[PDB]
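User: Can you write out an input/output pair for a complex, sequences first and structure second?

Assistant: Here is one pair. Inputs:
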Amino acid sequence: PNYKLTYFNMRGRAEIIRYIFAYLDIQYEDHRIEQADWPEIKSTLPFGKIPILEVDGLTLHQSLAIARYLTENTDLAGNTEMEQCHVDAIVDTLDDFMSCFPWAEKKQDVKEQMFNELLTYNAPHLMQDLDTYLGGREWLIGNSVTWADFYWEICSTTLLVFKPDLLDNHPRLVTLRKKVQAIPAVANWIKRRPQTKL
Amino acid sequence: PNYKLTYFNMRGRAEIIRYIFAYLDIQYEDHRIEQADWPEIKSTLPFGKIPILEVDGLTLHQSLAIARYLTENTDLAGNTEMEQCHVDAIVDTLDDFMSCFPWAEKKQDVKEQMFNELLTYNAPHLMQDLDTYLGGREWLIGNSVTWADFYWEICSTTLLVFKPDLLDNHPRLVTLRKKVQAIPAVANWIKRRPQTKL
Ligand SMILES: COCCCNC(=O)c1nc(-c2cccc3[nH]ccc23)no1
Ligand SMILES: COCCCNC(=O)c1nc(-c2cccc3[nH]ccc23)no1
Ligand SMILES: N[C@@H](CCC(=O)N[C@@H](CS)C(=O)NCC(=O)O)C(=O)O
Ligand SMILES: N[C@@H](CCC(=O)N[C@@H](CS)C(=O)NCC(=O)O)C(=O)O
Ligand SMILES: [Mg+2]
């Protein structure tokens, strides 16, 4: 099975897919494009959005649909049917927040204002909600790591770029981040991946 | 199982779950709230959003996470892992767009202008994409109805309230809506359900 992942040269929405490839030890082409190459790719796509993942000549889309597909019937999926639901819910909650950010906003002052508002007013409540949900458990869902723990680490890493103090009052969330970063395949990918701001 | 769904008295984000319950002939309590009991209830919710689904003492959240869980091991979900990925992707593409609308905006002129903007530029672009993706095939994914077909009928039913002419040059998408509506269990539900604008 031949894999080609296309995205911008950044972690962004594609990183969850990259973590999953790493963990499952699957080789793939990590295709990263410039903004100036985007329009000619975009015009050929069914839905005009990245990331996309090509598998044996079939173009998949939607970052989380792809991540869910790649983890189905692996240990990164929930351990029960209910656990898979919890995984999906946490992932969407995180995605809902990250999606609020005006990432492609060209007017810098308007962009700054919004980032500031979401990070100062909204991000702290999500952290609180996540902290209580985790409680004293080892992973977000069940007794072993799921791709929701992956997604938490990935989202939180980007949020900490803009707001370094985000988890000062949430040591158990920091512990979860660190636990994720300690998984051998993930540590390895973290070590060797392209370093970009986002 | 003792299923209890909580949402506003409206179709909204809960409707997909209601279609699935109806189609799979799964009994549930359809609890609807006024604003009166909203800020009250918004407290015991671990994430303060609806819909939620209570199943034997567990409060589940995220409308699409719940929907997917209920489709588990049925033809409705997609017939292969790959089809399930297509179903998940279409649903997320739809949800991404519906999420763009300022549903709660209190300034009536701002709301009107944003709705018009989205329905004039974004919606026709997405419609061309959806139409070409479906082609002259029977269903969006595979040889039989999936919950992605359900979600398309659901999202478009609401969009048509605001722009009645939205599908006037998309007969294949109209045909899809009609095919979904005439599925007996869906036809039964659509007649039985409370009449609300949204
Ligand atoms: C022309 O657009 C360039 C791509 C801009 N996108 C970003 O900068 C970016 N998006 C996300 C993002 C969005 C939604 C969910 C997410 N989860 C993790 C990152 C992320 N992070 O960075
Ligand atoms: C006090 O706040 C209540 C906001 C009222 N909400 C709506 O009218 C609404 N419907 C939808 C909706 C319907 C179908 C699919 C959807 N996907 C995302 C939102 C949505 N979203 O908001
Ligand atoms: N919900 C989708 C969103 C995909 C998306 O909108 N990606 C952005 C980049 S992060 C994009 O394609 N922007 C360029 C464009 O819209 O033309 C997903 O997770 O894949
Ligand atoms: N992505 C979530 C969104 C949940 C959501 O934002 N619910 C809406 C109801 S349409 C809401 O206004 N929640 C209550 C609130 O935020 O006050 C889902 O699909 O379940
Ligand atoms: Mg989503």
